[PDB]
Short mmCIF file of C-alpha atoms and ligand atoms in Angstrom, two decimals:
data_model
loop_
_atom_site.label_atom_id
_atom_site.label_comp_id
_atom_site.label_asym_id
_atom_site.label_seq_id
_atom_site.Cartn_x
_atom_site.Cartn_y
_atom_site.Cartn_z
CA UNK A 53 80.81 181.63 151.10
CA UNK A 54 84.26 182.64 151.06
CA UNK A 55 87.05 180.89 152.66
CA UNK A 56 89.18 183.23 155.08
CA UNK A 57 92.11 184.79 154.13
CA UNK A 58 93.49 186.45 157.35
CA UNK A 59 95.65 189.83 157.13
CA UNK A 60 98.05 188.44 159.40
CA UNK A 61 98.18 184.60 161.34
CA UNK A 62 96.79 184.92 164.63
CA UNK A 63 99.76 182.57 166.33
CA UNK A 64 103.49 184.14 164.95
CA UNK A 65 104.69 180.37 164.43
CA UNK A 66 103.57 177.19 164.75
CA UNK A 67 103.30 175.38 168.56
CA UNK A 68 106.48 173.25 169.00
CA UNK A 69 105.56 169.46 169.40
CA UNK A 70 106.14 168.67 172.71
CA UNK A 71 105.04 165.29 172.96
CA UNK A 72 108.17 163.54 170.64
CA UNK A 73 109.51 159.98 170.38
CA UNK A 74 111.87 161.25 173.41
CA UNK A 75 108.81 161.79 175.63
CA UNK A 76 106.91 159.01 174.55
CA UNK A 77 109.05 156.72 176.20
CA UNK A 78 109.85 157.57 179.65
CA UNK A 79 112.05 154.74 181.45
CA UNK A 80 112.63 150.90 180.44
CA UNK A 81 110.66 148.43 183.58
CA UNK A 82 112.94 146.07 185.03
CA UNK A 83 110.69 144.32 187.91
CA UNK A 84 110.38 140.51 187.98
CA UNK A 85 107.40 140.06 186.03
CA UNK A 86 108.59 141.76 183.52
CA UNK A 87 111.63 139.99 182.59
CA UNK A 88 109.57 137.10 181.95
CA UNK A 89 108.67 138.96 179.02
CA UNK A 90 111.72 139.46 177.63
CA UNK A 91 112.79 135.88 177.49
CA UNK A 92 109.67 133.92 177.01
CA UNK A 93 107.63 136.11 175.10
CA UNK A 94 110.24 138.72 172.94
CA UNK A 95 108.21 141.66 174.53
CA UNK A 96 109.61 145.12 176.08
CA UNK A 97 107.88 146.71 178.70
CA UNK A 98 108.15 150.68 178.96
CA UNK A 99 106.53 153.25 181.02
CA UNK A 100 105.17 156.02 178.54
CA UNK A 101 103.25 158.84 178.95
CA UNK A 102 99.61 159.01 179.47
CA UNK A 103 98.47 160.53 176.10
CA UNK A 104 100.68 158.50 174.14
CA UNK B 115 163.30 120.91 193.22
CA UNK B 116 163.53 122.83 190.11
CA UNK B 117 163.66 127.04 189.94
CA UNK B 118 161.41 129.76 188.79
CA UNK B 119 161.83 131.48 185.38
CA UNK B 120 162.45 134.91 184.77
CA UNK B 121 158.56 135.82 184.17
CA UNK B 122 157.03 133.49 186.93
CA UNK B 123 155.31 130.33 185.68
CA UNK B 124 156.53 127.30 188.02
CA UNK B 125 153.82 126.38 190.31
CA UNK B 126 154.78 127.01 194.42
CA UNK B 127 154.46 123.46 194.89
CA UNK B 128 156.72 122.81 192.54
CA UNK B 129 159.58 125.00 193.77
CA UNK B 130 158.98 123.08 197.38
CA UNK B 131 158.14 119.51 196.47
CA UNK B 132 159.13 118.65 199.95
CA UNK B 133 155.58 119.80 201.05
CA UNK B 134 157.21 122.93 203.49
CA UNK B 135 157.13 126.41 202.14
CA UNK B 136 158.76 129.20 203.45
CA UNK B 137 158.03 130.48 207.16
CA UNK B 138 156.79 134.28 207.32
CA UNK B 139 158.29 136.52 210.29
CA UNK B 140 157.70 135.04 213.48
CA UNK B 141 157.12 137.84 216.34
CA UNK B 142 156.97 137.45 220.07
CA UNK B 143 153.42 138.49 221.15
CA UNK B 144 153.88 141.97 222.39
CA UNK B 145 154.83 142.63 226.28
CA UNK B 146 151.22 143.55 227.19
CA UNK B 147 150.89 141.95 230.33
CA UNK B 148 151.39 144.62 232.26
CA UNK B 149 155.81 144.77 231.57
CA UNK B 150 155.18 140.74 231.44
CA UNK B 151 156.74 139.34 228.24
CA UNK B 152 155.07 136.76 226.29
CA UNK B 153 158.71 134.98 225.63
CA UNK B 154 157.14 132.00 227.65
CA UNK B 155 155.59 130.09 225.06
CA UNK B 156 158.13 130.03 222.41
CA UNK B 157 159.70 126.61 225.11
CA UNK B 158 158.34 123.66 223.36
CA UNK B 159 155.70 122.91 225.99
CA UNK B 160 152.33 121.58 225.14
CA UNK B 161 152.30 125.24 223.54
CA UNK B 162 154.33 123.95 220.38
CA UNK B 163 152.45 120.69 220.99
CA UNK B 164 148.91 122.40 219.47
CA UNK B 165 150.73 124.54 217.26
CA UNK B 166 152.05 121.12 215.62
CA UNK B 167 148.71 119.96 215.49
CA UNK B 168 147.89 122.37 213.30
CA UNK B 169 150.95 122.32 210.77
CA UNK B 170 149.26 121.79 208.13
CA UNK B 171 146.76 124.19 207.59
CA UNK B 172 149.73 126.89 208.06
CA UNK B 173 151.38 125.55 205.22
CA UNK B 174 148.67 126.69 203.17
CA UNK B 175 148.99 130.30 204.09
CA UNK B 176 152.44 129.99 203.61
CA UNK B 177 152.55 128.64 199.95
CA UNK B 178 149.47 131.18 199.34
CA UNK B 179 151.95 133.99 200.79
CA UNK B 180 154.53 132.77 199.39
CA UNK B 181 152.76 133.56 195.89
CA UNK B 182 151.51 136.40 196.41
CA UNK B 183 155.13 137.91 196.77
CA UNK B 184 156.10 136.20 193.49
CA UNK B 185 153.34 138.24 192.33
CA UNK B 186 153.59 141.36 193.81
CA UNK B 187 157.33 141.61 192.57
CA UNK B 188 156.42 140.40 189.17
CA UNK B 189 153.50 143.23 188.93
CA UNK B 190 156.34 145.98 190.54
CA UNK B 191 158.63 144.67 187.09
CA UNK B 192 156.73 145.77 184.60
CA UNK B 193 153.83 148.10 186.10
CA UNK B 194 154.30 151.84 184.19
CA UNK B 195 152.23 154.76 183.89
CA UNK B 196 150.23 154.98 180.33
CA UNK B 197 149.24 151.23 180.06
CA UNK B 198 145.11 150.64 181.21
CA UNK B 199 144.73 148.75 184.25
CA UNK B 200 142.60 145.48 181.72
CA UNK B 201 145.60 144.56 180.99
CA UNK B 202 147.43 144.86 184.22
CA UNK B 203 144.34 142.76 186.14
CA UNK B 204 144.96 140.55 183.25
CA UNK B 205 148.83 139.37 183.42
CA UNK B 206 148.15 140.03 187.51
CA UNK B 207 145.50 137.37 186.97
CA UNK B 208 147.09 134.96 184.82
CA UNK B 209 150.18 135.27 186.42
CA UNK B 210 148.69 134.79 189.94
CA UNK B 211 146.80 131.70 188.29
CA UNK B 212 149.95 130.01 187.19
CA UNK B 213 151.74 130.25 190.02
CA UNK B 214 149.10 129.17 192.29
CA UNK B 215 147.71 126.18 189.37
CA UNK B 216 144.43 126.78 190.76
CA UNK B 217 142.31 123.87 189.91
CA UNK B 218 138.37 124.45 191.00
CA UNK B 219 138.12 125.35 194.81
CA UNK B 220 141.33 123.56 196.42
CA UNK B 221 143.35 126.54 194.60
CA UNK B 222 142.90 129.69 193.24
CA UNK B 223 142.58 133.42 193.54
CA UNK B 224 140.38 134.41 196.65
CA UNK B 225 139.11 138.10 195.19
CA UNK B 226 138.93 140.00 192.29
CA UNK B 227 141.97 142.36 192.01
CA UNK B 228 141.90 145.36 193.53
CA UNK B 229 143.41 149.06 191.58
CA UNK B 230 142.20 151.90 193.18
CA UNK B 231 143.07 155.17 191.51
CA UNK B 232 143.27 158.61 193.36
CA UNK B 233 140.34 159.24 195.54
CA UNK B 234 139.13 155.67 195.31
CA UNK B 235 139.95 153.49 198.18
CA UNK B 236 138.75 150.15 197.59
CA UNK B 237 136.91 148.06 195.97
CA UNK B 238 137.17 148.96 192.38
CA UNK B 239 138.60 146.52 189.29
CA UNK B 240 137.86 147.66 185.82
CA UNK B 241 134.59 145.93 183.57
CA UNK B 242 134.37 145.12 179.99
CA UNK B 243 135.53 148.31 178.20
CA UNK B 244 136.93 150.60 180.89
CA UNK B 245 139.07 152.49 178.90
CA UNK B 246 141.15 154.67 181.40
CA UNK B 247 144.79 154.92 181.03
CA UNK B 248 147.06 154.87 183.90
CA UNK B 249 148.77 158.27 184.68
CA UNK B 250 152.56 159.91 185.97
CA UNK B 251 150.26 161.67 188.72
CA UNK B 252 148.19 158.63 190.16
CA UNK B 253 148.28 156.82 192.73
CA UNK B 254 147.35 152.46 192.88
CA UNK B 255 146.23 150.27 195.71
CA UNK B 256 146.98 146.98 194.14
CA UNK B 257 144.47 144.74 196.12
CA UNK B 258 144.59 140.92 195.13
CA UNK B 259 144.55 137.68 197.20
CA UNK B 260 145.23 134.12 196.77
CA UNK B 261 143.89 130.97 198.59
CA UNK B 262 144.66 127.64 199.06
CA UNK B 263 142.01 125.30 200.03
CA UNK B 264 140.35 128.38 201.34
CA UNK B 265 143.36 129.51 203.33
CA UNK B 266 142.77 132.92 202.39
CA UNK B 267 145.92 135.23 202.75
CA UNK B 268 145.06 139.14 201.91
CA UNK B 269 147.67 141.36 200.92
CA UNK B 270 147.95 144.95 199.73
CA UNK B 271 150.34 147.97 198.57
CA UNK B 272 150.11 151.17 196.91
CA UNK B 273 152.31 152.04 193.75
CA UNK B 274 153.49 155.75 193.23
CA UNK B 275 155.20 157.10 189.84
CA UNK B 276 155.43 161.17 190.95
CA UNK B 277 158.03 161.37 194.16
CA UNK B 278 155.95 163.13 195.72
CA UNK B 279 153.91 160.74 197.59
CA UNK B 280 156.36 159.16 199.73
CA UNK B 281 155.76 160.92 202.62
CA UNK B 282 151.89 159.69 202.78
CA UNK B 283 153.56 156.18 201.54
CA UNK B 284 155.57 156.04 204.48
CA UNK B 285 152.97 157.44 206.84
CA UNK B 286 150.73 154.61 205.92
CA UNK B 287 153.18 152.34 205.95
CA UNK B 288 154.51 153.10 209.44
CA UNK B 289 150.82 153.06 210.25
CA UNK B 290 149.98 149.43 208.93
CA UNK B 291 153.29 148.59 210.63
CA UNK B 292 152.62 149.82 214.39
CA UNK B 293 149.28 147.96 213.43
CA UNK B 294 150.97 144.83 213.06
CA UNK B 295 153.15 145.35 216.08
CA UNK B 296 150.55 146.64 218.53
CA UNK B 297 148.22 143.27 217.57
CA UNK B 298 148.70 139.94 219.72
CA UNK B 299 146.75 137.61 221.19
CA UNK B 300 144.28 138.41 224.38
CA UNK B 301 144.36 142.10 223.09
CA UNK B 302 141.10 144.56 222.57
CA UNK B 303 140.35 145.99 218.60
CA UNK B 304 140.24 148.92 220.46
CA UNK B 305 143.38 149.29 221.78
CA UNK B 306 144.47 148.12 218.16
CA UNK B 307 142.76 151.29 216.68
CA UNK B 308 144.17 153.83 219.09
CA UNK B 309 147.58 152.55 218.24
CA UNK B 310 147.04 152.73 214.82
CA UNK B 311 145.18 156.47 215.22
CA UNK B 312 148.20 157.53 217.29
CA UNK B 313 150.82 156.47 215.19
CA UNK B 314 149.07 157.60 211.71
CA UNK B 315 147.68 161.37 211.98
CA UNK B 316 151.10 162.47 213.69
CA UNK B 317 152.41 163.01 209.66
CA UNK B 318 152.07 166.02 207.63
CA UNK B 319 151.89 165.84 203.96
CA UNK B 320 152.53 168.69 201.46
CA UNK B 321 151.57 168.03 197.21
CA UNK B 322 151.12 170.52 195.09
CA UNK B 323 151.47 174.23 197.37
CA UNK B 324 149.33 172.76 199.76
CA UNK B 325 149.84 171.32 203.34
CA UNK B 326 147.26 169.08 204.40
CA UNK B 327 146.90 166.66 207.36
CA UNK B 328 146.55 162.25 206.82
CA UNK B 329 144.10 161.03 208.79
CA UNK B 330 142.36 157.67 208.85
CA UNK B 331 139.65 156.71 207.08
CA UNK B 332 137.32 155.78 209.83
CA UNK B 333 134.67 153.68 207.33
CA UNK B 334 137.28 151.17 206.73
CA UNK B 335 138.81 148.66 208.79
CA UNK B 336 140.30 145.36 208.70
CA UNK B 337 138.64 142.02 209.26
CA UNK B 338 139.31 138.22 210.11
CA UNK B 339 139.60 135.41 207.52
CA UNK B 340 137.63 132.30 207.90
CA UNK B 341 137.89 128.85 205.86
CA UNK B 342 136.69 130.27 202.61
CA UNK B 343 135.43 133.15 204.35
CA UNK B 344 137.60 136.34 203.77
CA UNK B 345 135.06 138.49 206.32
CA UNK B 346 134.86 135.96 209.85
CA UNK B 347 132.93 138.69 211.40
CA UNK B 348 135.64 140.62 213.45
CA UNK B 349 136.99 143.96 212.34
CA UNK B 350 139.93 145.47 213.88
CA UNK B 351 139.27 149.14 213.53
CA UNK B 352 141.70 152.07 212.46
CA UNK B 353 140.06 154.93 214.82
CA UNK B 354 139.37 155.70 218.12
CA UNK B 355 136.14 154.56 220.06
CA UNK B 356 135.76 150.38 219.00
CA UNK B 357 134.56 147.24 220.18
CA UNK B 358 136.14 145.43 222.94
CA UNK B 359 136.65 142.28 221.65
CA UNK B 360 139.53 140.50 221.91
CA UNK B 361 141.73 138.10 219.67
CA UNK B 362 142.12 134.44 220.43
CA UNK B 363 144.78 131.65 219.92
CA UNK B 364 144.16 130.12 216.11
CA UNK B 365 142.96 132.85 214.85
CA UNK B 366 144.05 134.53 211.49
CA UNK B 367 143.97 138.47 211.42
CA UNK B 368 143.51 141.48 208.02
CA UNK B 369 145.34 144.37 209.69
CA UNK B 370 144.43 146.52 207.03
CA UNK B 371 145.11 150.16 207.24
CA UNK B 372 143.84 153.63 205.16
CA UNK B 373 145.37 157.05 204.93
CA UNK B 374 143.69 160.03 203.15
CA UNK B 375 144.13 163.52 202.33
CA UNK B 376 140.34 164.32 202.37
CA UNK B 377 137.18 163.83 204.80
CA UNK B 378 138.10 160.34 206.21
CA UNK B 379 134.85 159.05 205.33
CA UNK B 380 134.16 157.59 202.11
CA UNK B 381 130.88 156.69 199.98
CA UNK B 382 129.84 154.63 196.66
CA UNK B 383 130.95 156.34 193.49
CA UNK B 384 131.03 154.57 190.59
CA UNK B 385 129.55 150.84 189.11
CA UNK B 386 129.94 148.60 191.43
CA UNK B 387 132.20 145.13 190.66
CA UNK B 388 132.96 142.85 193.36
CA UNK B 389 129.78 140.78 194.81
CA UNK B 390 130.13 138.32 197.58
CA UNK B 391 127.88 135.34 197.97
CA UNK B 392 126.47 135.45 201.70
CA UNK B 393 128.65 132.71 204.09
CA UNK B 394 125.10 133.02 206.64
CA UNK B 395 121.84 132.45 204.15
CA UNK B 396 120.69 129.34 203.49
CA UNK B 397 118.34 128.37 200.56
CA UNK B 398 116.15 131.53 199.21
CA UNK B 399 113.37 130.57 196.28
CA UNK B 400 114.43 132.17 192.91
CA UNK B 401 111.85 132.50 190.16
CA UNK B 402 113.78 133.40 187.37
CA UNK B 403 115.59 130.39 184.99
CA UNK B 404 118.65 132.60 184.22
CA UNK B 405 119.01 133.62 187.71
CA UNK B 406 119.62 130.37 188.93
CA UNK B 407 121.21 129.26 185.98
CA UNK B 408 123.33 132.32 187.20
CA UNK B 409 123.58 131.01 190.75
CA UNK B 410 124.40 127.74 190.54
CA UNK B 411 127.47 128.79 188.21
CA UNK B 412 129.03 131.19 191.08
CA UNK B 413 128.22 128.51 193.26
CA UNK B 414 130.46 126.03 191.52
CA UNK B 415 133.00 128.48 190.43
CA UNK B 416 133.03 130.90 192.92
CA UNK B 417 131.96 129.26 196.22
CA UNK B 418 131.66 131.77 199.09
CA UNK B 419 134.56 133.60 197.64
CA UNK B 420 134.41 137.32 196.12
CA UNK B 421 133.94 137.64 192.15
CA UNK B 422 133.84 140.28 189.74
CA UNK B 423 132.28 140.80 186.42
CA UNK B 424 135.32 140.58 184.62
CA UNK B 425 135.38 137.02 185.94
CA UNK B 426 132.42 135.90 184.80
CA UNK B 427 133.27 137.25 180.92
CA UNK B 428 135.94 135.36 180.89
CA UNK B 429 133.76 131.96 181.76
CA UNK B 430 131.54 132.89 178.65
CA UNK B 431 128.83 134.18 180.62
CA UNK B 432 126.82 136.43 178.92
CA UNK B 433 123.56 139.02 180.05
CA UNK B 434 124.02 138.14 183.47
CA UNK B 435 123.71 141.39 185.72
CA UNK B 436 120.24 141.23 185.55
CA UNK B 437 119.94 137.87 187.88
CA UNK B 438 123.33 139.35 189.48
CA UNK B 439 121.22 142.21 190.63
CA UNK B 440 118.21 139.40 191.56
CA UNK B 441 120.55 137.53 193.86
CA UNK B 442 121.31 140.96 195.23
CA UNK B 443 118.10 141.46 196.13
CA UNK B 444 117.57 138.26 197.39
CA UNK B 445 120.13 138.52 199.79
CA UNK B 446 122.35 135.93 198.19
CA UNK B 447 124.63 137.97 196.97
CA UNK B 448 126.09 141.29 198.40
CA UNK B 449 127.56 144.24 196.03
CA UNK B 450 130.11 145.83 197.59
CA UNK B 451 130.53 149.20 194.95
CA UNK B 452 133.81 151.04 194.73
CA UNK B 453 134.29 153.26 198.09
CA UNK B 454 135.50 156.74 197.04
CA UNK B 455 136.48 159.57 199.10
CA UNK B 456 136.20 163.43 197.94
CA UNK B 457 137.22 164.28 194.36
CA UNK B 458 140.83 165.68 194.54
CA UNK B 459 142.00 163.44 197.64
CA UNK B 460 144.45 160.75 197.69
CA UNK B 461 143.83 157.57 199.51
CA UNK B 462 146.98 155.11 200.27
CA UNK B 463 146.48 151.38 201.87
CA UNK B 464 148.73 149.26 202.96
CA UNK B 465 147.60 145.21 204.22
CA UNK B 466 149.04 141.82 205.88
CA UNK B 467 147.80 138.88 206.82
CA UNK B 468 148.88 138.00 210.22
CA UNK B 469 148.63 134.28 212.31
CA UNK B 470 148.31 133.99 215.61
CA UNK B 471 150.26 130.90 216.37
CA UNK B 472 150.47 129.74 219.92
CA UNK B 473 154.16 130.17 220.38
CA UNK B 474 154.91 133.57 218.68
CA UNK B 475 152.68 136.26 215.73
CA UNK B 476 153.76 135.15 212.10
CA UNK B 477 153.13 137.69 209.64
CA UNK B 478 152.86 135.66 206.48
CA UNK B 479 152.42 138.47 204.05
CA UNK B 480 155.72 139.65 205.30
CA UNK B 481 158.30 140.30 202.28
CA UNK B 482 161.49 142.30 201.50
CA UNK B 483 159.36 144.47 199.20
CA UNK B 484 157.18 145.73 202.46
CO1 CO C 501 140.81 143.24 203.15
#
């Protein structure tokens, strides 16, 4: 069984990432609850996107 | 009785150990009563019999005026285009709290100060690092008050480097003036505003090529002062169309006046600075340690009177818009963000503080400067 060696790539260039550290985090959270979090417990809270 | 150095540092009190500091301009209440002078109460009748009885809370206003003018013509000394306004609030600031000696509430400045630039009308002091240098083409409102024992007295002027303001200078000024004039006691806000409409937007103002027409700006308006309360709930307006309210014996008057060459109107721009603590609410649960950590310190420091961020960096307070913001949601404190008119547009304000004594109008703010 031979492993393919295509005449030409099917796709000209690679797919840009479009999911990067820029879209992983959307927006810092800044309700009540969470600034509990900050203080007492040294945690961030983010809103990130859903595939992350 | 000693006398005040070159830069100002002797305390008022100082310079009138006696306890009496100077009068401001006393005005007969205007003829109003239909051709009727009011040169019937200035006889010392039972008239002058109240007004004694309340001697001493005018000498308050008067020291607190008498201050501010100290101030004001220390600031006009050295102010010059090309130095950041940081350091002007600062020596305004430290110069205001030496000459006042403010010691906790009984003395001490009564609201952040106040420098509006160009289309900005009020409102606006610098925060930690605002880096903007002052300009030859700008125009100031320098905005700053001074209490004592919550005698609040509420001044204001507008600074010009390039000549070729004066005209919109002197409209506003011969606005703020009529104003004064035009107010008395038993008088509608109304009538008040038409004066001040009718005496303002018939001035025509040319910079740069182009003619354009002052005009009030209709948002603003000027208020009463209260003990410790620099908003008693009654607004004189500037325009046409107001309340028809009148003004009582005892009462103590902001006839504050705008002038701009844009829309009139004016909107939030920029960060906001100045926060008020609410005279009206009562006690509102917080949940957060740092906010009333936060809450208690205004409370103690600040009172009911207006602060400013800058103010509470320089008490070592740290991380603290957060639970500003809180209180600002829960009503105890109210922002009030810089108000801004369209980009391109001049604004120019001019402010006194007026008493309505029962014998005659003293404008305390009233000094040879303006
Ligand atoms: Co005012």
């Amino acid at each position: 069984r031979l492993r393919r060696q295509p005449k030409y790539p099917r796709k000209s260039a690679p797919r840009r990432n479009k999911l990067d550290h820029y879209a992983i985090i959307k927006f810092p959270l800044t309700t009540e609850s969470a600034m509990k979090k900050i203080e007492d417990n040294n945690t961030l809270v983010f809103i990130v996107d859903v595939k992350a | 009785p000693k006398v005040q150095t070159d830069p100002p540092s002797v305390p008022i009190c100082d310079l009138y150990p006696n306890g009496v500091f100077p009068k401001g301009q006393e005005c007969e209440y205007p003829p109003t009563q239909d051709g009727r002078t009011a040169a019937w109460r200035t006889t010392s009748e039972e008239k002058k019999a109240l007004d004694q009885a309340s001697e001493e809370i005018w000498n308050d206003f008067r020291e607190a005026a008498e201050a501010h003018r100290q101030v004001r013509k220390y600031v006009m000394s050295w102010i010059k285009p090309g130095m950041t306004m940081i350091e002007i609030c600062e020596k305004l600031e430290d110069c205001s709290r030496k000459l006042i000696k403010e010691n906790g509430l009984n003395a001490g400045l009564a609201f952040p100060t106040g420098c509006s630039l160009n289309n900005c009308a009020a409102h606006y002091t610098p925060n930690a690092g605002d880096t903007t240098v002052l300009q030859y083409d700008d125009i100031c409102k320098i905005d700053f008050g001074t209490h004592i024992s919550g005698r609040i007295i509420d001044c204001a002027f507008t600074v010009t480097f390039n000549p070729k303001y004066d005209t919109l200078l002197k409209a506003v000024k011969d606005a703020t003036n009529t104003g004064i004039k035009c107010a008395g006691i038993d008088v509608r806000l109304c009538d008040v505003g038409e004066a001040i409409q009718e005496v303002m937007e018939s001035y025509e103002v040319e910079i740069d090529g182009k003619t354009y027409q002052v005009k009030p700006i209709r948002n603003l308006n000027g208020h009463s002062i209260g003990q410790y309360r620099i908003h008693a709930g009654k607004t004189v307006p500037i325009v046409k169309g107001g309340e028809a309210t009148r003004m009582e014996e005892g009462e103590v008057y902001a006839i504050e006046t705008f002038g701009s060459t844009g829309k009139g109107v004016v909107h939030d721009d920029m960060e906001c600075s100045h926060y008020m603590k609410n005279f009206d609410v009562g006690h509102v649960p917080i949940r957060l340690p740092r906010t009333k950590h936060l809450l208690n310190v205004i409370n103690e420091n600040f009172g009911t009177l207006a602060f400013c961020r800058r103010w509470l960096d320089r008490l070592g307070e740290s991380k603290y818009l957060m639970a500003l913001k809180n209180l600002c949601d829960l009503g105890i404190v109210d922002p009030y963000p810089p108000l801004c008119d369209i980009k391109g547009s001049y604004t120019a304000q001019f402010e006194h503080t007026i008493l309505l004594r029962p014998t005659c109008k003293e404008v305390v703010s009233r000094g040879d400067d303006y």
